[PDB]
Design an enzyme around this catalytic site. Structure first.
Site, PDB file in Angstrom:
ATOM      1  N   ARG A  16      -8.530  14.763   9.930  1.00 18.18           N
ATOM      2  CA  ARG A  16      -8.798  13.998  11.145  1.00 18.18           C
ATOM      3  C   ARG A  16      -7.671  14.268  12.128  1.00 18.18           C
ATOM      4  NH1 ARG A  16      -6.555  12.300   6.461  1.00 18.18           N
ATOM      5  NH2 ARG A  16      -8.246  10.802   6.069  1.00 18.18           N
TER       6      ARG A  16
ATOM      7  N   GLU B 273      -9.163  15.628   3.200  1.00 11.69           N
ATOM      8  CA  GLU B 273      -9.501  14.724   4.296  1.00 11.69           C
ATOM      9  C   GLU B 273      -8.808  15.244   5.553  1.00 11.69           C
ATOM     10  OE1 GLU B 273      -9.150  10.519   3.176  1.00 11.69           O
ATOM     11  OE2 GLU B 273     -10.839  10.902   1.852  1.00 11.69           O
TER      12      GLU B 273
ATOM     13  N   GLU C 135     -13.561  12.545  11.514  1.00  9.80           N
ATOM     14  CA  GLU C 135     -12.899  12.650  10.223  1.00  9.80           C
ATOM     15  C   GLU C 135     -13.849  13.258   9.209  1.00  9.80           C
ATOM     16  OE1 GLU C 135     -12.301   9.204   7.421  1.00  9.80           O
ATOM     17  OE2 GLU C 135     -10.201   9.689   7.877  1.00  9.80           O
TER      18      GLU C 135
ATOM     19  N   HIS D 150       0.815  -1.208   0.000  1.00 13.82           N
ATOM     20  CA  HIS D 150       0.000   0.000   0.000  1.00 13.82           C
ATOM     21  C   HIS D 150       0.852   1.263   0.000  1.00 13.82           C
ATOM     22  CE1 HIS D 150      -4.361  -0.021   0.247  1.00 13.82           C
ATOM     23  NE2 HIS D 150      -4.220  -1.347   0.404  1.00 13.82           N
TER      24      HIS D 150
HETATM   25  C1  LIG Z   1      -3.189   1.980   0.421  1.00 11.95           C
HETATM   26  C2  LIG Z   1      -3.699   2.669   1.670  1.00 11.95           C
HETATM   27  C3  LIG Z   1      -2.786   2.969   2.708  1.00 11.95           C
HETATM   28  C4  LIG Z   1      -3.201   3.748   3.813  1.00 11.95           C
HETATM   29  C5  LIG Z   1      -4.594   4.092   3.990  1.00 11.95           C
HETATM   30  C6  LIG Z   1      -5.509   3.767   2.950  1.00 11.95           C
HETATM   31  C7  LIG Z   1      -5.093   3.127   1.794  1.00 11.95           C
HETATM   32  C8  LIG Z   1      -6.096   2.849   0.693  1.00 11.95           C
HETATM   33  N1  LIG Z   1      -5.122   4.547   5.185  1.00 11.95           N
HETATM   34  C9  LIG Z   1      -4.268   4.774   6.218  1.00 11.95           C
HETATM   35  C10 LIG Z   1      -4.779   5.145   7.531  1.00 11.95           C
HETATM   36  O1  LIG Z   1      -5.964   5.268   7.782  1.00 11.95           O
HETATM   37  N2  LIG Z   1      -3.841   5.470   8.502  1.00 11.95           N
HETATM   38  C11 LIG Z   1      -2.436   5.305   8.276  1.00 11.95           C
HETATM   39  O2  LIG Z   1      -1.707   5.728   9.127  1.00 11.95           O
HETATM   40  N3  LIG Z   1      -1.966   4.911   7.095  1.00 11.95           N
HETATM   41  C12 LIG Z   1      -2.818   4.579   6.076  1.00 11.95           C
HETATM   42  N4  LIG Z   1      -2.317   4.143   4.886  1.00 11.95           N
HETATM   43  C13 LIG Z   1      -0.851   4.186   4.631  1.00 11.95           C
HETATM   44  C14 LIG Z   1      -0.152   2.895   5.168  1.00 11.95           C
HETATM   45  O3  LIG Z   1      -0.068   3.005   6.585  1.00 11.95           O
HETATM   46  C15 LIG Z   1       1.249   2.855   4.584  1.00 11.95           C
HETATM   47  O4  LIG Z   1       1.156   2.848   3.160  1.00 11.95           O
HETATM   48  C16 LIG Z   1       1.944   1.562   5.046  1.00 11.95           C
HETATM   49  O5  LIG Z   1       3.368   1.758   5.135  1.00 11.95           O
HETATM   50  C17 LIG Z   1       1.595   0.437   4.065  1.00 11.95           C
HETATM   51  O6  LIG Z   1       1.832  -0.970   4.752  1.00 11.95           O
HETATM   52  P1  LIG Z   1       1.987  -2.186   3.861  1.00 11.95           P
HETATM   53  O7  LIG Z   1       1.614  -3.344   4.810  1.00 11.95           O
HETATM   54  O8  LIG Z   1       1.253  -2.115   2.677  1.00 11.95           O
HETATM   55  O9  LIG Z   1       3.423  -2.274   3.459  1.00 11.95           O
HETATM   56  P2  LIG Z   1       4.388  -2.021   2.215  1.00 11.95           P
HETATM   57  O10 LIG Z   1       3.869  -0.959   1.316  1.00 11.95           O
HETATM   58  O11 LIG Z   1       4.872  -3.180   1.688  1.00 11.95           O
HETATM   59  O12 LIG Z   1       5.584  -1.251   2.832  1.00 11.95           O
HETATM   60  C18 LIG Z   1       5.399   0.060   3.485  1.00 11.95           C
HETATM   61  C19 LIG Z   1       6.648   0.348   4.361  1.00 11.95           C
HETATM   62  O13 LIG Z   1       6.749  -0.622   5.457  1.00 11.95           O
HETATM   63  C20 LIG Z   1       8.134  -1.127   5.431  1.00 11.95           C
HETATM   64  N5  LIG Z   1       7.998  -2.476   5.969  1.00 11.95           N
HETATM   65  C21 LIG Z   1       7.121  -3.465   5.556  1.00 11.95           C
HETATM   66  N6  LIG Z   1       7.255  -4.587   6.254  1.00 11.95           N
HETATM   67  C22 LIG Z   1       8.249  -4.321   7.172  1.00 11.95           C
HETATM   68  C23 LIG Z   1       9.044  -5.216   8.041  1.00 11.95           C
HETATM   69  N7  LIG Z   1       8.832  -6.504   8.163  1.00 11.95           N
HETATM   70  N8  LIG Z   1      10.073  -4.600   8.725  1.00 11.95           N
HETATM   71  C24 LIG Z   1      10.391  -3.283   8.553  1.00 11.95           C
HETATM   72  N9  LIG Z   1       9.805  -2.431   7.693  1.00 11.95           N
HETATM   73  C25 LIG Z   1       8.710  -2.977   7.051  1.00 11.95           C
HETATM   74  C26 LIG Z   1       8.543  -1.012   3.990  1.00 11.95           C
HETATM   75  O14 LIG Z   1       9.941  -1.066   3.871  1.00 11.95           O
HETATM   76  C27 LIG Z   1       8.032   0.394   3.719  1.00 11.95           C
HETATM   77  O15 LIG Z   1       8.837   1.443   4.157  1.00 11.95           O
END
Ligand SMILES: *Cc1cc2c(cc1C)nc1c(=O)[nH]c(=O)nc-1n2C[C@H](O)[C@H](O)[C@H](O)COP(=O)(O)OP(=O)(O)OC[C@H]1O[C@@H](n2cnc3c(N)ncnc32)[C@H](O)[C@@H]1O
Length: 541
Positions: A405, A403, A255, A65
């Site tokens: 909140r 948005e 929100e 995400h």
């Molecule tokens: C797509 C989206 C995201 C989102 C949102 C609504 C939508 C449609 N609503 C949010 C909300 O209400 N409140 C909030 O704070 N954030 C919200 N988001 C954003 C979301 O938190 C971030 O995009 C999040 O980082 C996405 O997590 P996801 O599980 O998808 O992970 P990823 O994209 O692969 O990586 C994101 C980052 O996390 C680091 N990462 C991932 N796994 C680990 C581990 N195991 N160890 C250390 N770091 C980790 C990635 O490297 C990266 O930086």
């Protein structure tokens, strides 16, 4: 697609698959990347050591995400990068109810919805949940993920809960760390000075598991309003009427989603109840999350507008905003979703990945709770002026909603286990030089990816916010997970990325626990920079 170069002497028991990569917003798309699914934390260690010996990089892959290019960068050469999907196997969940405070241990690949669903089975829960439950816990902690929760005036924070980010709930975590001669697993307690930079690490550290505290679960109401004019909802401090500040004072959680060129926002207000004990007579009881079906599924007239906008018709904006508002108003009524009630997760999880793909700008204003109305009134009036300014020139750089909140900060009082402090670089970290600053006001603007002039506007907004909200009464901090450093494209303003972000995170804090302290910790744990990419090297050298 052309096959990627075969990695040299890759571990034979770790299957490698070439897959495309696409983040949720689809702004980051690569036709080919190497991906594997480590079966155990030790397999991540094996990957790290192999990567080190062959000059490859390793990136944890959660739910994808992420808007911020912390996994892979658009158009980057990833021939020497291995993505480790943590959700395939590193998703174990165990609730620990034996101790001073209940906790839950989860593999970094477990989704937050899975975690809180298990917590619910034990009458436990989290108070400030992100809107989408699909996020991996590792990905959520990486950016101090949060919700729109604040306690109502006079409401006490139950033991175990926090109104700050999820990162503030960590009691212990395990990561892949360099031990002097090789990478290995290492566990840190919340009372360990070395843990603070890891609580919110932007993916600079690879977490394999985390343990977080949990408070008692609770019933919560979620009321929606689409009949309040925006000038009334976002009025000056002390104004009469149905104001944002009054909703926050009375209920705590709130929100607003204000569609472009519309008169009335979609306002959501969450209220904690004092097994239907406490259910408001007028509220509909729900037993599952994602209760706004009309938003996670759009009709043809709307999909056609989106298609036409993507085809080069940005002038549809003045019609699109109202159309989205109408779908919301009509949908809430038809599905009787204006007043719902249920367990915390059922009313706080309301965003499904199927919602419209948008990219965001804006950020957080850390300030005193009494300053909420002023911050919001200033921003919304400024935004209103700017969108009309461009419309007056026949330009429509804004076709998504505003948005807004608020939530709390990573308060030390919320942590019920010995702790050395809050996450080092979370946007929700309290400011020592300003004990009265106790809320984070998230001001975001969303838009369709590819919209001409959108990023130029986000840059204009970023500059306005930095100038407007950095004073004796407030500080501005970009929301890590969203866009920032617009130059004009996000993450490209070199001065912000390499100088201003650091400045933001050394301000008002000790030289023994700031941005530099964090970088030092990250480099000690990973001196070979296995857990990095080009952008990360500019941000966190
Ligand atoms: C797509 C989206 C995201 C989102 C949102 C609504 C939508 C449609 N609503 C949010 C909300 O209400 N409140 C909030 O704070 N954030 C919200 N988001 C954003 C979301 O938190 C971030 O995009 C999040 O980082 C996405 O997590 P996801 O599980 O998808 O992970 P990823 O994209 O692969 O990586 C994101 C980052 O996390 C680091 N990462 C991932 N796994 C680990 C581990 N195991 N160890 C250390 N770091 C980790 C990635 O490297 C990266 O930086």
């Amino acid at each position: 697609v052309a096959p990627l170069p075969t990695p040299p002497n890759f571990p034979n028991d770790i299957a490698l698959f070439q897959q495309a990569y696409q983040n949720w917003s689809k702004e980051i798309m690569l036709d080919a990347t190497w991906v594997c699914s480590p079966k155990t934390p030790q397999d991540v260690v094996r990957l790290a050591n192999w990567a080190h010996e062959h000059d490859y990089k390793i990136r944890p892959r959660g739910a994808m995400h992420g808007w911020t290019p912390l996994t892979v960068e658009k158009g980057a050469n990833v021939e020497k990068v291995i993505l480790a999907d943590t959700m395939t196997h590193l998703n174990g969940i165990t609730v620990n109810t034996g101790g001073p405070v209940a906790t839950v241990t989860a593999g970094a690949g477990a989704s937050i919805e899975a975690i809180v669903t298990e917590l619910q089975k034990h009458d436990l829960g989290w108070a400030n949940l992100p809107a989408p439950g699909v996020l991996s816990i590792g990905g959520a902690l990486a950016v101090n993920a949060h919700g729109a929760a604040l306690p109502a005036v006079g409401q006490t924070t139950l033991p175990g809960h926090t109104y700050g980010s999820l990162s503030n709930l960590v009691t212990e975590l395990t990561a892949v760390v360099w031990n002097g001669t090789t990478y290995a697993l290492e566990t840190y307690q919340r009372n360990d000075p070395r843990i603070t930079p890891l609580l919110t690490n932007l993916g600079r550290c690879f977490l394999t598991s985390v343990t977080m505290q949990a408070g008692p679960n609770f019933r919560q109401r979620c009321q929606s309003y689409t009949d309040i004019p925006w000038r009334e909802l976002f009025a000056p401090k002390g104004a009469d009427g149905r104001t944002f500040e009054k909703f926050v004072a009375e209920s705590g959680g709130a929100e607003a989603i204000w569609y472009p060129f519309t008169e009335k926002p979609w306002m959501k207000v969450w209220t904690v109840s004092p097994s239907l004990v406490g259910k408001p007579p007028q509220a509909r009881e729900v037993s599952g999350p994602y209760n706004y079906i009309f938003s996670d599924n759009l009709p043809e007239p709307i999909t056609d507008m989106i298609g036409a906008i993507n085809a080069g018709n940005p002038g549809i904006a003045p019609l699109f905003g109202p159309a989205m508002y109408e779908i919301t108003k009509l949908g809430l009524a038809a599905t009787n979703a204006n007043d719902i009630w249920g367990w915390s997760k059922d009313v706080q999880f309301y965003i499904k990945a199927t919602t419209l793909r948008l990219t965001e700008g804006g950020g957080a204003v850390v300030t005193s709770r009494a300053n909420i109305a002023t911050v919001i009134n200033d921003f919304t009036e400024w935004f209103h002026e700017r969108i009309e300014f461009y419309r007056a020139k026949g330009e429509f750089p804004l076709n998504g909603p505003v948005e807004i909140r608020c939530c709390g900060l990573d308060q030390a009082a919320d942590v019920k286990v010995p702790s050395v402090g809050p996450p080092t670089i979370s946007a929700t970290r309290p400011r020592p030089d300003h004990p009265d600053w106790d809320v984070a006001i998230w001001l975001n603007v969303l838009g369709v990816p590819g919209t001409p002039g959108m990023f130029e506007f986000y840059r204009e907004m970023e500059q306005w916010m930095r100038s407007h909200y950095n004073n004796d009464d407030a500080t501005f901090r970009p929301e890590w997970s969203k866009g920032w450093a617009f130059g004009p494209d996000p993450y490209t303003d070199n001065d912000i990325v390499t100088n201003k972000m650091r400045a933001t995170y050394i301000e008002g804090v000790p030289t023994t626990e700031n941005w530099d302290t964090a970088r030092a910790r990250y480099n000690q744990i990973d001196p070979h920079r296995v857990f990095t990419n080009g952008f990360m090297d500019k941000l966190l050298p």
